[PDB]
Amino acid sequence: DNQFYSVEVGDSTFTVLKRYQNLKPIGSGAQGIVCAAYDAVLDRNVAIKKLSRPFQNQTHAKRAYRELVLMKCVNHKNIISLLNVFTPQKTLEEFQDVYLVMELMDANLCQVIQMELDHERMSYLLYQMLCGIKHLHSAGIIHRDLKPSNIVVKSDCTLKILDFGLARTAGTSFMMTPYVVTRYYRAPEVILGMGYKENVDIWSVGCIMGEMVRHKILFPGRDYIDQWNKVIEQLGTPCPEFMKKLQPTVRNYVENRPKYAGLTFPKLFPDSLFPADSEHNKLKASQARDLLSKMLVIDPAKRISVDDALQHPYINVWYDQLDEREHTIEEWKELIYKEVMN
């Protein structure tokens, strides 16, 4: 009689439409609170994400709203597409939770990165990331925060980007919740507050690709201080022309850091990290190292574009505005509610 039922999945209560059966937590890789379930109507397995009081603060509200709007005007095989959106609450006054429903995947990209993958698999995952990223840019979305934990994969190696990245406006306001933001995949133009173009996302692809090879986060650190140190110790101090594009205060800090020549790409990614069993693999290792050297480039003006990355020999084998202004709790609640109601 009631269209919904509630079930305990870990520490969270999931109140879902009765079509969704056998809820099981994914736990990792995901994210917020995400369940696997059987959709009896579509006779297919789904993933269900619960957004708990998304209007509770400015940060959760901006992201919930922006992603609800974009998950509607984006249509691509390598970008999340929603099967359903619902709230168990009947009125705006009663409104609390948003549930998002998508195709159930098999792993997040962090798990895949931990595997010893062949060149076929590595090049195929990278091509899809580049394809999804190309789609976003054509829609006028520049991600800026692409990271493995918001990327999921199926057993057949098909890939999907689950989020839309950083807000147009800022400045990444505090989060009074026990969770940390992963910043290791952010481009120098993001680390140093610089201004950017489409290829800001190429750096993130390079960090993901390097980690697949190395099996260690390329640029770790407590925050941006430590992180920038990791970037300059490995790639070398950037050229004077890149530094003439930084804000005065940021420029001062960067130029006053000790100088590093930077390790060469064969030293940053030796042959021993790649299969050396055949001629086919010897060429694929040199092609992968060449693409890494074009992607992990501090200056964006000298960094490879999405289109040129797609045409790169390691990759091309696979070729076949509203509303970020300040709002109160009540305003965000209504804006989110009407998008949930469409």
Ligand X SMILES: Cc1cc(NC(=O)c2cccc(-n3cc(NC(=O)Nc4ccccc4Cl)cn3)c2)ccn1
Pick the stretch among 104-112, 165-173, 292-300, 311-319 that binds ligand X (CB under 6 A).
104-112
Of 1-30, binders to ligand X (CB under 6 A) are 26, 29-30
**Smallest distance, ligand X to C-beta of residue 152, A:** 5
CB of 124 to ligand X, least distance (A): 18
Q: Is 28 annotated as a binding residue?
A: yes
Q: Is 118 a catalytic residue?
A: no
| Shortest CB 30 distance to ligand X, Å | 3
Taking CB under 6 A as the criterion, the residue among 12, 15, 31, 229 binding ligand X is 31
CB nearer to ligand X: give 276 or 341: 341
Is residue 192 near ligand X by the rule CB under 6 A?
A: no
Binding of ligand X by 136 (CB under 6 A): no
The label of the residue with tokens 């056998």 reads 22
Residue from 37, 64, 74, 107 touching ligand X (CB under 6 A): that is: 107
Task: Pick from 108, 123, 128, 237 the residue near ligand X by CB under 6 A.
Answer: 108
34 lies in the binding site for ligand X (CB under 6 A)? yes
Asked if 106 interacts with ligand X (CB under 6 A), we say yes
Annotated ligand binding at 227? The verdict is: no
289 binds ligand X (CB under 6 A): no
When asked if residue 268 is in the footprint of ligand X (CB under 6 A), the reply is no
> Facing residues of 16 across strands?
5
Q: What is the 3-state secondary structure (H, E, C) of the chain?
A: CCCEEEEEECCEEEEEECCEEEEEECCCCCCCEEEEEEECCCCEEEEEEEEECCCCCHHHHHHHHHHHHHCCCCCCCCECCCCEEECCCCCCCCCCEEEEEEECCCEEHHHHHCCCCCHHHHHHHHHHHHHHHHHHHHCCCCCCCCCHHHEEECCCCCEEECCCCCCCCCCCCCCCCCCCCCCCCCCHHHHCCCCCCCCHHHHHHHHHHHHHHHCCCCCCCCCHHHHHHHHHHHHCCCCHHHHCCCCHHHHHHHHCCCCCCCCCHHHHCCHHHCCCCCHHHHHHHHHHHHHHHHHCCCCHHHCCCHHHHHHCCCCHHHCCCCCCCCCCHHHHHHHHHHHHHC
Catalytic choice (39, 145, 163, 201)? 145
When the beta carbons of 105 and 268 are compared against ligand X, the nearer one is 105
- For position 298 contacting ligand X by CB under 6 A, the verdict is no
Site membership for ligand X, residue 102 (CB under 6 A): yes
152 scored as a contact of ligand X (CB under 6 A): yes
Q: Which amino acid is at 239?
A: C
Hey, which residues are catalytic here? 145
List contacts with ligand X (CB under 6 A): 26, 29-31, 34, 36, 45, 47-49, 80, 100-102, 104-108, 152, 162
Annotated binding residues for ATP, written as ranges, equal 26-34, 49
